Each structure stands twice: as structure tokens, then as C-alpha cells.
Amino acid sequence: MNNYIFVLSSLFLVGCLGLALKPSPIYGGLGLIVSGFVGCLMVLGFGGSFLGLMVFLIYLGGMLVVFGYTTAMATEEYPETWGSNWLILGFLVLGVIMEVFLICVLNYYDEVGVINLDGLGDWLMYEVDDVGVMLEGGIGVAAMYSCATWMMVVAGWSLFAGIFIIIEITRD
Amino acid sequence: MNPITLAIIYFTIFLGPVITMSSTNLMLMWVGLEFSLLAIIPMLINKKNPRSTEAATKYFVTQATASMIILLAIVLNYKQLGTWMFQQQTNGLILNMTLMALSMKLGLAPFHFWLPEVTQGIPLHMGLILLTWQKIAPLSILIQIYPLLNSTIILMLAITSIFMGAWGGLNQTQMRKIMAYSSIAHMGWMLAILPYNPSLTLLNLMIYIILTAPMFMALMLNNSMTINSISLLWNKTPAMLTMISLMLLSLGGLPPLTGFLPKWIIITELMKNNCLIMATLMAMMALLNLFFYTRLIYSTSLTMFPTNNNSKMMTHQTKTKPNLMFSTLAIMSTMTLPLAPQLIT
Amino acid sequence: PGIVELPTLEELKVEEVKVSSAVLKAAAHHYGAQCDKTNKEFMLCRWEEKDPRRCLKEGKLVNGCALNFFRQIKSHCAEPFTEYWTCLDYSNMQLFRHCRQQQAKFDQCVLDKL
Amino acid sequence: MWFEILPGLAIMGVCLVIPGVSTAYIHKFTNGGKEKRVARVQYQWYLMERDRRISGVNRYYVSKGLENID
Amino acid sequence: MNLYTVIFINILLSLTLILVAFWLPQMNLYSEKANPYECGFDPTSSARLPFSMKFFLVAITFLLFDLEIALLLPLPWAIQTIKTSTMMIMAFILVTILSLGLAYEWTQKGLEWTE
Amino acid sequence: AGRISAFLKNAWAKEPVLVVSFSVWGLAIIMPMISPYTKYASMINKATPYNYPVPVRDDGNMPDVPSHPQDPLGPSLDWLKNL
Amino acid sequence: PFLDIQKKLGISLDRHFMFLSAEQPYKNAARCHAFEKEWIECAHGIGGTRAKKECKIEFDDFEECLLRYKTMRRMHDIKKQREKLMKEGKYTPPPHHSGREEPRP
Amino acid sequence: RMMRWNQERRRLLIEDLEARIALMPLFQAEKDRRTLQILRENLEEEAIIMKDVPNWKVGESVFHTTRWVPPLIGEMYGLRTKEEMSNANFGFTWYT
Amino acid sequence: MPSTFFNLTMAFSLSLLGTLMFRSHLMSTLLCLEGMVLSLFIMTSVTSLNSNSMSSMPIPITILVFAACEAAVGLALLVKVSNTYGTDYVQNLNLLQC
Amino acid sequence: MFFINILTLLVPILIAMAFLTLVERKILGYMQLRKGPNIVGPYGILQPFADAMKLFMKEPMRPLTTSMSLFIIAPTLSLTLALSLWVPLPMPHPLINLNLGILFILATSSLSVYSILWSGWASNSKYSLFGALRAVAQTISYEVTMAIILLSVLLMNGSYSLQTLITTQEHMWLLLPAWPMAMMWFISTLAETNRAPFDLTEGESELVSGFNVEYAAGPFALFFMAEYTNIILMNALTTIIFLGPLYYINLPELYSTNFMMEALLLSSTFLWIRASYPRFRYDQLMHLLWKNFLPLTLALCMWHISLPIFTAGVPPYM
Ligand SMILES: CCCCCCCCCCCCCCCCCC(=O)OC[C@H](COP(=O)([O-])OCC[N+](C)(C)C)OC(=O)CCCCCCCCCCCCCCCCC
Ligand SMILES: CCCCCCCCCCCCCCCCCC(=O)OC[C@H](COP(=O)(O)OCCN)OC(=O)CCCCCCCCCCCCCCCCC
């Protein structure tokens, strides 16, 4: 229960490795969905649930549209997965081996640098308000409605101008 | 484009760099960069040809990658220092990543490979909007963090920018590619003077903008995209040859044109900071830039290339295209050297 | 740098209130009304002197006032308060609105007495 | 007729009342005659942990009243 | 811990069901058994070919609208603010801008499907 | 105008969803500007005590703040109790 | 910023959440609020170069609070020495560090 | 009906928060006393463990300032059991 | 937290490496961009939750909003590329060299 | 004891799903002037067990063109997400008490859509591809509209928890203040659960079987269980949100009984609707949810932003 966050971070690294290795975009979207779920779990473990659930929902919608698009136009007769190419699968297992080697090197040589296996699970939650109401992560995002109205208006104008932009690009 | 979407797109194009320059927060500067990129893509792809589609795609992926590296630098600084500004003690790796990503957004060598290609295939007014307006916000971000940057990496980027711009402008015949390599060389000069005196960076930027604007307007008069196309300008608009020659010589940095002033004062400041080798190499590559400008002048003004038969009908027709702001910018970019102490601060 | 100076277990020893949260919430309003001055002194010293080691005397005074308050309740109003905190303890949130008859009887007892 | 549906409806009704009733009874049984405490905020979680420390049996639901006060 | 336990129990239950479904019945598979289904005839072409999408603009609009939803979702905590006038004005502006974008796309026939 | 009313009736007959949407939008815009309870929402949110009221050090110079919570001085919530 | 339109107009579009010790919702103090406040109070009015030279103590305290590098090193050294003493067997944990203690509220 | 019931709910929430406010000084005193006790026994254990380590100051702070720095969860539960550490880290998050 | 942040930084580095090392699929390049975005979001969110910076908690949502606008424009450009060529091949997007 | 609680949640939900299949057969038959199953068992009550046993003793299909990994992964994913969506519902006490319950519901529903999509793509068939693309369009439309609906309802409620919804409806149903968005939420749940007229993914007449046209036996059973568990799930969510059962602190059995009766009524309404109406065309579903529901949903969202402000009925945080 100490290395739970580290296991999640390693799974996120593996998912990003597969996404970098670039299979067919169906499998790329699958890896991105798994990475988004893992990142949601990481934000959940580190603190408020709202940011993790938000990025989860956003990436579910995004990879849904991506799946529709890759079935539309970014497809091939034989879609390429991680196991179809010997070079891609070799790069996958080599990246896993390199990750294990790098975390062992940072455990041994660098001592307490970025990775410490003895200190793992000790520095996840630094300071928490033991007694207290109004502490959850969604309240800051709510404070965007009051404290950062400039942030609110630039986000809203980004979405509005984006609607106009996509209409003009796909106007044809 | 209906006027509603014209107003929305042009207002967001304007608003991007304005937010970037006025923003205290690095995140708001970043979203200003996002505004500029997203708003300028549809006007790039507005003509809906395969070349415009390729140019828009290349520009999008390049600026998106560079903006992601910028966001990485911002998030790493926020992790290290807890604030949203590179104050004084941010990591040199973070600052170098910021510089590298902003140089890829600007389009200076060796990150320059997309800029002649994006400048090609888009209309001339969009090339003007790109090569003048799109560089102000990244330069503002670089200017805000001038004492923190690394002089070695900046000078290397600047010298390779001026070298590659000189060689590319030497090779190309397409006018948009020539202007893009000119942009690369002048961005190299601006980056070279950036860590020592950003006032000279702003001066060189303003001189380059007021020199680039009427050259693009004169190209926009007849849609002359080629050396030959600008070479038969004597039959079409004979009254513009002198101003074309003067503006190209000012771009070359020849005295007594006012375009000699940015190179002169940048060299002076580098000599004050004891970078004589860099200054001399930059000046020689600026001579190469002046060479391809002079070949352009030979093609369009000093000689007279053969004309066509339909140019008689084009002379029968009348035009109202050159606007009121062309001559003001041409004169202010040609004959303003005696006001050099006023142009500098 | 210099070493940190923090008090010992003998200085931190006090008669703690071995009283459950439902019991505390049942006696909450009268504890906030009767032991208000000592509690406000402790909060003032804590929010003026940020160091918690400068307020151990005030914390012990707060514990003593709470102990005296609960001893007075046990002396005079034991059974209505007992059933009141039991009925409060049944609820998962310990909502005051679920138990109002027991609250009324406890309030009547601590109004006619004390 | 239309009342032959009622056996399947009754089986569905029993299978839908079982989870909620059983969950309430299991919460009451595992928390000792009281509902399972909800800690939606850090204050409520701190109350639950304080009760767990106070009880002396490492169970928050064992409440201590005035019998611990002299 | 309890949520993780019940998620793992669901995973184990479904894996057990599919495992017993694959290892319990008798296997007899041949080429015509496992050929793809095209209503009794052979497929003319592979199903991995490009398959045109007539609501792609609506999908991009769905991306933008989903992010508008993400912006609107902290409202139940935003209504607890002291300055309710600023929150109310900002929420009204956001919903009105979203509605104007939808109306503009409806006017420009972006909601209609191509061909 | 008669033509405006005829257009409105035609819209209400044929496309009532948009008419209801625009009417609800207008009512949501104009209703807080005319309701007398609008200030009460902000006052309730201000009166909700999420944070501890940190006591102030009395130098004997401010007479307005109460010495005890059960004092006549201070922001009472009788308006909320009778609301 | 490159342009000071916010300072000229007196508005604060983004200047009020530039750091941890800025305005916070419901007065929830961020971590190292005191350290960052001390660093800004030191560095204000003297410029960046003098702030780097002379407020090094405040910056180092703030950085140590934020990243806790030395705290991690100290705790790792304590735990490594403890496990070495356990391996050579000349040390036993106290009861209150081994799970059985007398809890206090 | 929703307006009236929400106003009643607001009054009940204010009553609950006032009960929390009335109980808060005792909880604060108990919490800082417990934190000081845990830090004290950790300091004593550090004195026992690293008495033979050269150039080691027992209880040396990592801050130049002498004001109070509230200890981290890792500071006050580093030397205790892993189950107690996990309870301090993930207890509220994993209690559903 | 430091091991987690190092792993997130390496995840961003891998996604950037994937973006910089093209294969035939522009959609796969856009997916690598979205992976970079996801790593940035997780880093910002865990930094804000670790430092209790509720004032800076709107920043990850703003990152998601602008990045989704980026992805939307990328999908529109991929639509135009596929209408031009029939595929999303960056090897087909090459005729601007001369 | 927690494992026993898991069992007494999971097993009765599965039996209620199977008897929902039976009761759908009976109700559809009696609405179609016939009887439905009454031979297999006393009154047909052994028919779902017969169907389950037949499907789990029939051999599965592993087509040659089919991606085996995703073909296996999709149905178990669908069943796990159905049970996971069932887990946090309060009746009146949930097995897993969450703060952002409806956000968990939305995430798990979208992941179930992904299970359908991956099944359709893995089963390398053109009808499966049609089912996947129709699922994409359907979930686009209902996702945006249902998200705004739930946002407005919880703005009236005040928090994302569901015990808070019980406390909100302690005195009155939310159907009375929010009945237009209750109707739109009901249609959204129909489209989410892929029930007629918005099924469009297991298209019986348009396609052959759609996304599960290559699935046979066991995995097909898993898909059917996931779908009908989602039917009972979404109707239970609808009656928790809008038709608040009577809740008393001293006895929760009354709440469980009232919840059961209203959930049975809503499920029977689902079967009634399937009997009554013909199927939509899947572009008409998108046009409906984007041209009629969505503008009205935005207007009502603005109205529910304004309403507690000008009525001072801002809901409590807790
Ligand atoms: C859970 C609670 C109960 C929910 C209802 C459950 C029982 C009823 C179920 C019926 C069966 C449904 C099966 C699926 C049907 C699918 C078709 C369908 O519904 O299409 C939607 C139809 C669509 O109509 P249409 O498509 O025929 O219309 C044509 C539209 N054009 C031309 C643009 C294509 O209706 C709606 O969209 C209406 C949605 C509900 C609107 C409610 C408004 C109420 C009034 C608001 C306030 C008005 C006053 C404002 C203030 C004035 C002040 C002066
Ligand atoms: C076939 C493969 C299937 C892969 C996908 C599996 C999907 C599972 C079901 C859908 C999950 C959707 C995402 C849920 C994320 C967590 C939601 C949430 O809000 O959790 C918060 C909750 C407690 O937080 P809160 O509500 O704030 O309460 C604090 C005070 N009580 O609770 C917590 O904090 C607990 C944190 C952990 C919760 C998630 C546990 C997931 C377990 C791993 C599943 C996958 C295992 C790997 C694959 C196995 C082999 C196939």
C-alpha cells in the first residue's frame, strides 16, 4: 500500500511508451484511455477526485472521437499493433528493460535523488489539514468562477473561437 | 468567410499576442500563444489547395510540439519554485527548454526547416501576417526572461540562424521562400542581441517589420511569387522599382539606409560585450544576405526582363491596389538613418 | 542549523477527555457558550504565536475547562444528556435534526438547573 | 392473463429489496447498532479517528460517554 | 480499499464467466465456421477499409462542447461563493456563449450531415 | 406590431422548443434583477461559517465587537431565522 | 510582463494567483506560505540580482520547505541506520513505534 | 418548496458548523499536543539510534529559521509501522 | 512524490519522443501530442495537490481546454488531408519542398 | 462481512437481471396479445436459467479475421462496468459511499461505450463496424445532453453525492421542480442503455445484430447481462434522482421497498416503450438530441443557475 502510487506511475509510463511506439490508432487510443484511467487513479491517490474524474471523462470523449476518426480515415487493411512488428515489440521490451535498469540505477547510485525505494511510500502526502471543511480539489476549480474570471473568459473564448475555427477549416 | 467569422478569427489573431504581452502569468502567456496558433490556422488553410493544407498541417504540428515543450518548462518551474514565472533561480534546464521551444516557434535555425515551406503555399497577405505578427509574442516571452537565458546556446542558435538564412536566401527563387529566409536571418540577429540588450531586439524587430510590410505589399500588388514575376514589374508598375530597390538595400543593411542601423547597433553592443568573433561572422553572413537581395534587385530594377503581350492589356486596365500605408512604411524604412539616436534608446 | 526545542512527555501530560465525538457534538453548543473565554484565549495565542509550544498552558486550561463542564453535566443532567448523545450517535452524520425531543429535554434540564 | 407477469415481478422485487436492506443491516451489524459513519470531509474523518483512539479497542463505533469522566 | 476490492471481485467474476464459457463446451471449429459473416456470401472487401464519417464536424463540436461541460461542472461548488453576482454573471456568459456557438453552427449547417 | 405577433405565433406553433428556450433564457436573465431575495443568497453564503472565527486581541479601543458570543453585539442571523 | 496594461489600468487579471502565498479559497493556506511570504518580503524592492545574493537564506528555507530534499535525506539516514542496527541486532524498536501504544485524542 | 427546504437546510448546516466551531479549540489543543508527543518520541528514538554516527546532531533542523515548521506526515510517521503510515496517507481517501 | 514526478517526466519525454519520431500516421502523431498533454495535466494536478494550491487548481482545467481545442483543430486538418489524399500519410504531405 | 455485502449486492442484481429478461418476454407477449414463456418452469421462471445454461454450454466463436485480444476483452469489460456502476447506489445506504457519485457513473458509462466500440472493431465484420459507428454517434448526442441535464439537477441538489439527493427529496420529489429535464433525462437513459427507439447498435432489422453479430454463446451472454443490468441500473438511478422514495432514519426498509417499486415501474416503462415505438434513424437521434433537447437543456441550465440566486435557496455544501 506504499508502492501503490509508484506502480501506477510505472503503468502510466508503460502506456505512454506504447503510445510513443505508435500502433494502429485504435490501439493508440486504447493505450491513451488506459493511461488516462491510470492518471485519474494517480490524482485520486494524491488528492482530490475531481481533477482525475474530469481528465478521465475528457479523454473518454476525446478517444471516442479519435476512434471514429481512425475508423473513418486513418486506417489500413492490416492494422499494426505492438506484436505485428518484431522491431516494435523489441523496442517495447527494451523500453521496459531500460525502465527497470534506470530505476535500479537511481536506487543504487544516486541514493536519495528522484527515486528512493526505502523512502518510497513515505513522501506521498506531505501536509494535510486534519480538521477542516472546504478542502476538496473542486473548490478551486469553482473559484475559477469568482477568483479567476480572466481564466474563465479566456477558456470560454477559446471554445467559442474554436467552434468558428473548425467550421471554417472543414468548410471546404 | 462571412464577416462574423472574419471578425472572430481576426480578433483572436490580434488577441493572442496581446494577451501574451500583457500577461504576468506564464500560463496566460501560453494560452496567448495557443490563441495565436489556433486563430491563424484557418486563414492559412483558407485557400483550400493541397499546398495550403500541407502548410497548415506542418505549421500546426510544429507549433503544437513547441507549445507542449513550453508547457513542460512552465510546469517544471511551477514544481520547482511554486510560482508561475521564471523568477531568478529556476533551473537552467528549464530555461534552455523554454529557449529551444520558443526558437522552434519563432522559426530560427536549426528549427527553421518548416518556415520556408509554410511560407510557401499560403497567400502573400498570410505570409506577411505570419512573418510579422506571429513573432512578436515569442519575442516578448524571450525578452521577459532575458537575464536568465544562456548566452552560449543563444549565440549558437543565432549564428546558425544567420548562416542558414543566408544560404537559403541564396538558393531560393520563390519570393515567399526568400522572405522566409530573410526572416530567419533577422531573427538570428534579434536573438543574438537578446541577452545583452532587449531594447535592440525590439529595435531590430520594428525595423524588420516596417521593412517586411511594404515588400509584401509590393508583392501583393501583382501577386508576383517568382523572380521572373517580380522582374516584369517595369511593365506593370514602373513607379515602384526605386522603392523596391531601396527597401531591398535597406534589408541588406547598406548605409545610408535605415536598415543598416539595427545591424550596426547590434554589432556595437556585441563589441561592448566582447563577442568580436560572433559579430564578424554574423556580419559576413549578412553580406551573403545582401548578395541575394542584390541579385533580386538586378532581376527586378536595374535590368529589364522581357515582357508578355497581355501586359499591354494589363496596362490598359487601371489599379487602385497600393494603399495609403505603403508609402509611409517605405519612406520610414528607407530614409530614417539620421534619426538613429531617436530610434535607439 | 540549530536543533529544535520541543517539550517532553511530562510537559505534554494532561488529563485528556476520553469523550466520543457524538457526546462532544451533543454538548457542543453549551460547551461553546460556557467555556468560551478559555477557548478563545487559546485560539488567540495559537493564531498570534504560530508555534504550538508557546500555548501548552492555554491548551491545558482548555482541557480543564472541558473536564469541569462535563463533570458538571454528569453531576446534574446525566440521563437526558446520555439519551441525547445516544440518539445523536445513532445517525451517521450525527445530525441535530433527527433528535429534537431529546435535545429539548436536555436543554430544559440545563435551563431549569445551572 | 396479465397477472401471470406477477411471479416474475415478485422475484424481481425481492431481488431488488435484498441489496439495500442487507447493506443497511450489515452496516448496522458491523458498526454495532449504529449506521456506518460517513467521512465526507477531513473534519469528519478526524472525528472518526479520534473516536477510534478514544475507544481503546481500535474501533470507532465503541462510543464512550460520561463513564470515562470522573 | 473497499472500492478496489469490489472492482477486483467484478473483474474476477467476469473473467471466471468468460473462462468457463470458453473451456466448458465442446470445440469444433473449421474454416467455414470461423469465416466472417456477410449474410451468407463472401465479403467483397475487408472491413478494415476506410469507412466515411458524415458527422465528423459534429464530433469535433462534441469535443468542444464536452470541454464546455467540464467548465460548467464546478458550478455546485461555485454557487457557495460569497460573490454570487460575479459567479452568476460568469455562468450566464459561459452558457450564452455556448448557445451562440451552437446557434451559429446550426445556421451554417454544421449540424447537418454531409452528402 | 401585427407582423411581429404573427411571426411569434408561427414560431410558437411550428418550433415551440426554441420559443421555450429563448423565453427561459430571458426569464433567467431578468429574474434576479427584479427579485427581492437576490441579496439574501450572498448574505447566506457569507453567513455560512466554513472557517473558524479567529478572535481579535481587545485593546479596549473597539467597542463594537462582542466580548462573548451570547451578546447583543455582532451580526445576528434573525433575518435568516425568519427567512 | 512585456506590456504593463494591468498595472497602468490598476486591474489584476492574473496578478493575484502568481504564487503559493497568494489569495486562496476559504483561507486555506498553501504549503510553505510563511516561507514564501518571507522570501517575497525579503526580495521586494531590491531587484533580482540583490534578491539572489542577499535573500539566499529565505530562498533556501523556502526551497527546503517546498521540496524537502534534506528532510528526505535525514529520514533516509535515520531509517538506514535503524535497519542496520536491526540487522546486527543491537537495537529493538520501542512499543509505540511497533504498533502497540497508549493512544491519545 | 425547494426554496423553503434549501433555506432550512442552510440553517441546519450553519448549526452543524457552529457545533464544529465550538468543538474546534479542544481538537486543536489535543492535535498539537499529540503532534508534539509524537515528535518528542521520534526525537528520543533518533537519539537512541544514531548516537554512534559521527558528525550527527540529534534533532538538528533543516531550516535556517528558528520559527515553527509544522512536521510532515513523513516526518511524524516515518519511524512507525507501515500500516500506520498507510493509514495516515490513504486513510481518508480510501475510507468509503 | 519525487519518484512519481520523475516517472511522469519520463512519460512526457517518451510522448515527446514519439511526436518527434514520425511514423506514417498523422493520427498517431496527434495521439502522441495528447499523451504529452495528459502527462502535463497529471504533473500540474499532483503539484497543486501536493502544495495545496487551490488557487492554481484552475490551471490544469485550462490546460485541458486549450489542448482539446488543439486536438479539435488537428482533427479538422486531418480531415482536410484525408480529403486531399485518401490517407493521413505524412509521406503524402511532402510537396512543399519546391 | 464486506465480502458478504458484495455477494448480497451482486447476486440479487444478477437474478433481478435474469428475471428482467423473463418479465420483458412476458410483458412484450401480453402487449402483443400472446402469453410469453410459461412452460419452462411454473410460470416461465426457469426460462432465464435455461437460456443462460444453453448459452454457456454452446461453443464460442473465434473468427479468423477477428482480433482475439479485444474480442475477449470487450464483454468482460462490459459486465464489470455494469456491476461497477451498480456498486455506489444508495438504497438508502450504498455499498461504496462516494463523493462524486454521478461523475463515477458518467465515467463508467463512457467506458461501457468503449466496450461496445472495441467489440465492434475487434469482430472484423462490416455489420460490426456499422454498429460501432452508430454507437459513436449515439453516445456523442446523449453524452453532451445528459451531462448538461445532470449538471442542472445537481445544481438544484447542491452536491455530487447521492445520499444528498435522498436528503434533498426528503420532503418532495425533484420531478415537480425539474420535470422537463426529467423527461429529457429519461430519453437520455433510453439512448444510454440502447433501448428502443434508440437502440441502433444491436439493430435487428437495419443491421443483422450489429456490434455483437460475430459474438456467440458465452460472450454474447455477457453482453446481454451487461445491457439488462444497465437497464435496471439507469432506472434505479432515475428513481433515486427524480422520484425520491420515502426515507426515515429509524427504518430504511421503507426506502428500499419504495425504491424497488419505482424502479420496477420504470423498467416496465422501458419494456412498454420498446413495445410501443418504432426505431429511430440514427441521424435523427443526433438531430433530436442536438436541436431540440440541447437548446432547451442550456436554457434550463441557465434557469437553474439563476433560480437559487434569486430565491436564496442555495443548497448546502453538505
Ligand atoms: C423520469 C420521469 C418521467 C419521464 C417521462 C416518462 C414517460 C413518458 C415517455 C414517453 C415515451 C418516449 C419515447 C421516446 C420518444 C422520442 C421522441 C421525443 O421525445 O422527441 C422529443 C420531441 C421532439 O419534437 P419533434 O422532433 O416532433 O419536433 C419537431 C422539431 N423540429 C422541426 C426542429 C425537427 O419533443 C421535445 O424535444 C420536447 C422535450 C421536452 C420539452 C418540455 C417542455 C416543458 C415546458 C417548459 C416551460 C414552458 C413555459 C416557459 C415559461 C413561460 C412563461 C410565460
Ligand atoms: C478488464 C479490464 C478492466 C479495466 C478497467 C476497470 C474499470 C473499473 C470500473 C470503472 C472505474 C472508473 C474510475 C473510478 C476511479 C475512482 C472513482 C472515485 O471517485 O474514487 C474515489 C473513492 C473515494 O474517494 P471519495 O469519493 O473522495 O471519498 C473520500 C472519503 N470517503 O475511491 C478511492 O479513492 C479508491 C481508489 C481506487 C478505485 C479504483 C480501483 C480500480 C482497481 C483496478 C481495476 C483494474 C485492474 C487491472 C486489470 C486486471 C486484469 C484485467
PDB file of N, CA and C and ligand atoms in Angstrom, chain F residues 15 20 24, chain J residues 175 179-180 182-183 186-187 197-198 238 273 277 280 288 292-293 296, ligand 1:
ATOM      1  N   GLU F  15     -42.148  25.715 -34.142  1.00  0.00           N
ATOM      2  CA  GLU F  15     -40.908  25.436 -33.421  1.00  0.00           C
ATOM      3  C   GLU F  15     -41.051  25.925 -31.988  1.00  0.00           C
ATOM      4  N   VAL F  20     -39.573  28.254 -26.201  1.00  0.00           N
ATOM      5  CA  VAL F  20     -39.444  27.969 -24.774  1.00  0.00           C
ATOM      6  C   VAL F  20     -38.016  28.215 -24.304  1.00  0.00           C
ATOM      7  N   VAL F  24     -37.073  30.999 -21.528  1.00  0.00           N
ATOM      8  CA  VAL F  24     -36.435  30.603 -20.278  1.00  0.00           C
ATOM      9  C   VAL F  24     -35.097  31.316 -20.110  1.00  0.00           C
TER      10      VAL F  24
ATOM     11  N   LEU J 175     -39.126  15.583  -9.345  1.00  0.00           N
ATOM     12  CA  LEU J 175     -39.937  15.576 -10.555  1.00  0.00           C
ATOM     13  C   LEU J 175     -40.775  16.843 -10.665  1.00  0.00           C
ATOM     14  N   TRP J 179     -39.351  18.548 -13.863  1.00  0.00           N
ATOM     15  CA  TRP J 179     -39.954  17.567 -14.760  1.00  0.00           C
ATOM     16  C   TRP J 179     -39.614  17.687 -16.252  1.00  0.00           C
ATOM     17  N   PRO J 180     -39.316  18.860 -16.848  1.00  0.00           N
ATOM     18  CA  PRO J 180     -38.870  18.816 -18.257  1.00  0.00           C
ATOM     19  C   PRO J 180     -37.527  18.127 -18.430  1.00  0.00           C
ATOM     20  N   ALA J 182     -36.443  16.026 -16.361  1.00  0.00           N
ATOM     21  CA  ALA J 182     -36.707  14.626 -16.047  1.00  0.00           C
ATOM     22  C   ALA J 182     -37.088  13.845 -17.297  1.00  0.00           C
ATOM     23  N   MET J 183     -37.926  14.433 -18.154  1.00  0.00           N
ATOM     24  CA  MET J 183     -38.267  13.797 -19.423  1.00  0.00           C
ATOM     25  C   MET J 183     -37.039  13.644 -20.309  1.00  0.00           C
ATOM     26  N   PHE J 186     -34.909  10.929 -18.988  1.00  0.00           N
ATOM     27  CA  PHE J 186     -35.456   9.614 -19.296  1.00  0.00           C
ATOM     28  C   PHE J 186     -35.108   9.192 -20.719  1.00  0.00           C
ATOM     29  N   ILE J 187     -35.240  10.119 -21.670  1.00  0.00           N
ATOM     30  CA  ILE J 187     -34.864   9.822 -23.051  1.00  0.00           C
ATOM     31  C   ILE J 187     -33.361   9.575 -23.157  1.00  0.00           C
ATOM     32  N   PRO J 197     -36.754   3.453 -28.770  1.00  0.00           N
ATOM     33  CA  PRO J 197     -36.377   3.582 -30.180  1.00  0.00           C
ATOM     34  C   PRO J 197     -34.928   3.968 -30.459  1.00  0.00           C
ATOM     35  N   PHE J 198     -34.064   3.974 -29.447  1.00  0.00           N
ATOM     36  CA  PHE J 198     -32.696   4.447 -29.609  1.00  0.00           C
ATOM     37  C   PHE J 198     -31.672   3.331 -29.447  1.00  0.00           C
ATOM     38  N   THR J 238     -32.568   6.827 -12.145  1.00  0.00           N
ATOM     39  CA  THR J 238     -33.643   7.777 -12.403  1.00  0.00           C
ATOM     40  C   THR J 238     -34.568   7.913 -11.200  1.00  0.00           C
ATOM     41  N   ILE J 273     -42.202   1.009 -23.656  1.00  0.00           N
ATOM     42  CA  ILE J 273     -41.742   1.878 -24.734  1.00  0.00           C
ATOM     43  C   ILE J 273     -41.199   1.054 -25.893  1.00  0.00           C
ATOM     44  N   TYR J 277     -42.922   1.722 -29.621  1.00  0.00           N
ATOM     45  CA  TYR J 277     -42.483   2.649 -30.664  1.00  0.00           C
ATOM     46  C   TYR J 277     -41.587   1.989 -31.705  1.00  0.00           C
ATOM     47  N   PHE J 280     -35.818   4.757 -34.189  1.00  0.00           N
ATOM     48  CA  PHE J 280     -35.305   5.967 -34.813  1.00  0.00           C
ATOM     49  C   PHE J 280     -34.318   5.623 -35.925  1.00  0.00           C
ATOM     50  N   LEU J 288     -32.269  15.167 -33.086  1.00  0.00           N
ATOM     51  CA  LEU J 288     -33.151  15.390 -31.951  1.00  0.00           C
ATOM     52  C   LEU J 288     -32.378  15.903 -30.747  1.00  0.00           C
ATOM     53  N   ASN J 292     -33.333  19.830 -30.411  1.00  0.00           N
ATOM     54  CA  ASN J 292     -34.462  20.042 -29.524  1.00  0.00           C
ATOM     55  C   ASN J 292     -34.059  19.968 -28.062  1.00  0.00           C
ATOM     56  N   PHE J 293     -33.354  18.909 -27.672  1.00  0.00           N
ATOM     57  CA  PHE J 293     -33.027  18.736 -26.263  1.00  0.00           C
ATOM     58  C   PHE J 293     -31.950  19.716 -25.824  1.00  0.00           C
ATOM     59  N   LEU J 296     -32.883  23.576 -25.213  1.00  0.00           N
ATOM     60  CA  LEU J 296     -33.716  23.635 -24.023  1.00  0.00           C
ATOM     61  C   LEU J 296     -32.925  23.260 -22.782  1.00  0.00           C
TER      62      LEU J 296
HETATM   63  C1  LIG K   1     -38.467  10.077 -15.373  1.00  0.00           C
HETATM   64  C2  LIG K   1     -39.694  10.935 -15.296  1.00  0.00           C
HETATM   65  C3  LIG K   1     -40.693  10.629 -16.392  1.00  0.00           C
HETATM   66  C4  LIG K   1     -40.192  10.920 -17.793  1.00  0.00           C
HETATM   67  C5  LIG K   1     -41.213  10.598 -18.869  1.00  0.00           C
HETATM   68  C6  LIG K   1     -41.557   9.124 -18.956  1.00  0.00           C
HETATM   69  C7  LIG K   1     -42.923   8.843 -19.557  1.00  0.00           C
HETATM   70  C8  LIG K   1     -43.113   9.326 -20.983  1.00  0.00           C
HETATM   71  C9  LIG K   1     -42.326   8.552 -22.023  1.00  0.00           C
HETATM   72  C10 LIG K   1     -42.844   8.752 -23.434  1.00  0.00           C
HETATM   73  C11 LIG K   1     -42.177   7.879 -24.478  1.00  0.00           C
HETATM   74  C12 LIG K   1     -40.874   8.420 -25.031  1.00  0.00           C
HETATM   75  C13 LIG K   1     -40.241   7.524 -26.081  1.00  0.00           C
HETATM   76  C14 LIG K   1     -39.193   8.209 -26.937  1.00  0.00           C
HETATM   77  C15 LIG K   1     -39.729   9.408 -27.694  1.00  0.00           C
HETATM   78  C16 LIG K   1     -38.721  10.083 -28.608  1.00  0.00           C
HETATM   79  C17 LIG K   1     -39.272  11.321 -29.303  1.00  0.00           C
HETATM   80  C18 LIG K   1     -39.244  12.550 -28.445  1.00  0.00           C
HETATM   81  O1  LIG K   1     -39.440  12.569 -27.261  1.00  0.00           O
HETATM   82  O2  LIG K   1     -38.959  13.638 -29.159  1.00  0.00           O
HETATM   83  C19 LIG K   1     -38.836  14.872 -28.417  1.00  0.00           C
HETATM   84  C20 LIG K   1     -39.726  15.922 -29.030  1.00  0.00           C
HETATM   85  C21 LIG K   1     -39.192  16.475 -30.328  1.00  0.00           C
HETATM   86  O3  LIG K   1     -40.277  17.053 -31.078  1.00  0.00           O
HETATM   87  P1  LIG K   1     -40.282  16.936 -32.667  1.00  0.00           P
HETATM   88  O4  LIG K   1     -38.989  16.378 -33.119  1.00  0.00           O
HETATM   89  O5  LIG K   1     -41.535  16.261 -33.069  1.00  0.00           O
HETATM   90  O6  LIG K   1     -40.398  18.451 -33.146  1.00  0.00           O
HETATM   91  C22 LIG K   1     -40.048  18.849 -34.490  1.00  0.00           C
HETATM   92  C23 LIG K   1     -38.813  19.677 -34.270  1.00  0.00           C
HETATM   93  N1  LIG K   1     -38.001  20.002 -35.498  1.00  0.00           N
HETATM   94  C24 LIG K   1     -38.887  20.552 -36.572  1.00  0.00           C
HETATM   95  C25 LIG K   1     -36.954  21.017 -35.161  1.00  0.00           C
HETATM   96  C26 LIG K   1     -37.333  18.762 -36.006  1.00  0.00           C
HETATM   97  O7  LIG K   1     -40.042  16.953 -28.026  1.00  0.00           O
HETATM   98  C27 LIG K   1     -39.086  17.666 -27.396  1.00  0.00           C
HETATM   99  O8  LIG K   1     -37.958  17.796 -27.789  1.00  0.00           O
HETATM  100  C28 LIG K   1     -39.616  18.273 -26.132  1.00  0.00           C
HETATM  101  C29 LIG K   1     -38.799  17.877 -24.911  1.00  0.00           C
HETATM  102  C30 LIG K   1     -39.487  18.217 -23.601  1.00  0.00           C
HETATM  103  C31 LIG K   1     -39.921  19.665 -23.503  1.00  0.00           C
HETATM  104  C32 LIG K   1     -40.631  20.030 -22.215  1.00  0.00           C
HETATM  105  C33 LIG K   1     -41.018  21.496 -22.116  1.00  0.00           C
HETATM  106  C34 LIG K   1     -41.945  21.786 -20.953  1.00  0.00           C
HETATM  107  C35 LIG K   1     -42.361  23.236 -20.784  1.00  0.00           C
HETATM  108  C36 LIG K   1     -41.227  24.166 -20.397  1.00  0.00           C
HETATM  109  C37 LIG K   1     -41.686  25.520 -19.887  1.00  0.00           C
HETATM  110  C38 LIG K   1     -42.628  26.261 -20.823  1.00  0.00           C
HETATM  111  C39 LIG K   1     -43.006  27.651 -20.335  1.00  0.00           C
HETATM  112  C40 LIG K   1     -41.826  28.603 -20.221  1.00  0.00           C
HETATM  113  C41 LIG K   1     -42.111  29.862 -19.421  1.00  0.00           C
HETATM  114  C42 LIG K   1     -43.230  30.723 -19.974  1.00  0.00           C
HETATM  115  C43 LIG K   1     -43.538  31.940 -19.118  1.00  0.00           C
HETATM  116  C44 LIG K   1     -44.643  32.800 -19.682  1.00  0.00           C
END
